[PDB]
């Protein structure tokens, strides 16, 4: 419906699910990454000690943590060790948001079936590769 499609964002799904552990023990993420276009709705998540755009003071400097809730009809998936697949990524404001939680309301009713996700801004860190 109209309100469920107010926002348009990009989603990076690792289509391949062939991640494995090297002969040295390091983790190697699935190789084939694919970009997609999706539509949904993004709002701040107000609950308990959740931190939306909260500035954090540390001895090392300053951080910024954010988290949101997303309503959409697209089936995004989080990490699953039994099915052996990794989570998706959602691009908001040019930054990455990793899908951490999911709530399956699909197949409940005709016109109001949807999904809910809690997406957390990814922390800043340097990059390293282990590919075999």
């Amino acid at each position: 419906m109209r309100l469920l499609n107010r926002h348009s964002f990009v989603v990076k799904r690792k289509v391949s699910e062939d991640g494995y552990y090297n002969d040295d023990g390091d983790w190697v993420a699935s190789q084939d990454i694919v970009e997609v276009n999706c539509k949904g709705n993004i709002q701040p998540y107000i609950k308990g000690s959740v931190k939306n755009g909260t500035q954090i003071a540390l001895p090392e400097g300053i951080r910024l943590t954010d988290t949101r809730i997303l309503y959409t009809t697209y089936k995004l998936r989080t990490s699953d060790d039994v099915e052996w697949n990794e989570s998706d990524i959602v691009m908001i404001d040019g930054h990455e948001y990793e899908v951490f939680m999911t709530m399956d309301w699909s197949q409940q009713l005709a016109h109001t079936s949807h999904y809910e996700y809690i997406i957390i801004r990814r922390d800043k860190m340097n990059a390293v590769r282990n590919s075999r």
């Binding site: 951080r63 943590t65 922390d123």
Partner: protein, 196 residues
């Protein structure tokens, strides 16, 4: 030389840029990311977390396990004191491969060189160097690898006592007696000695 941790931290920060600057990230000015802990300016401004990997320098405290006063002397008419101090410092690496960088930093502080540069800048000697743990803290989303280390330093500080003064003239009086308490003394000796 006076002991001030604000200067020891600055000297260590300047030395580390050359000693271990090749393994660290670099900012917009091309300078390696080494900073003092709890950055702030103008009494309320707060610094941002640099790009990893980087280093943080934080002075813990200062103690005087070697007595209380080492020397008392006169340098110029002003009196002087010398005191021995010990200063443990904490250096941490944040990022990926923090242990691999702290190991090389350890292996360089023990060289005959580097220890001369530290004394050239801060005017202090390295006394000890503790072990390196391999820590992981969750933060949010992903863990962060860290590797703290403790480097103890030793320095002598000198201060000027502006209230002091020196003796340059002495006046002495004496007596001689056959028996204790002889009220009229047998002889009296009066002496006066000037510095000049």
């Amino acid at each position: 030389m006076q002991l001030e941790t604000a200067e020891l931290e600055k000297g260590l920060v300047r030395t580390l840029v050359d000693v271990i600057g090749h393994r660290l990230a670099r900012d917009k000015n091309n300078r390696p990311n080494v900073i003092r802990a709890y950055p702030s300016d103008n009494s309320n401004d707060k610094g941002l977390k640099p790009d990893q990997p980087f280093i943080t320098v934080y002075c813990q405290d200062a103690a005087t396990p070697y007595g209380w006063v080492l020397d008392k002397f006169v340098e110029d008419d002003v009196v002087c004191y010398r005191i021995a101090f010990q200063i443990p410092v904490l250096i941490t690496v944040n990022g990926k491969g923090a242990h691999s960088i702290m190991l090389e930093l350890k292996q360089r502080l023990e060289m005959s060189s580097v220890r001369d540069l530290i004394l050239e800048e801060t005017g202090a000697t390295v006394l000890d160097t503790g072990a390196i743990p391999n820590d992981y803290t969750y933060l949010n989303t992903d863990f962060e690898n860290s590797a703290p280390l403790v480097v103890t330093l030793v320095k002598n500080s000198v201060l000027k006592d502006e209230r002091g003064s020196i003796i340059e003239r002495v006046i002495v009086d004496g007596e001689l007696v056959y028996e204790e308490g002889q009220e009229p003394p047998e002889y009296t000796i009066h002496l006066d000695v000037d510095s000049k």
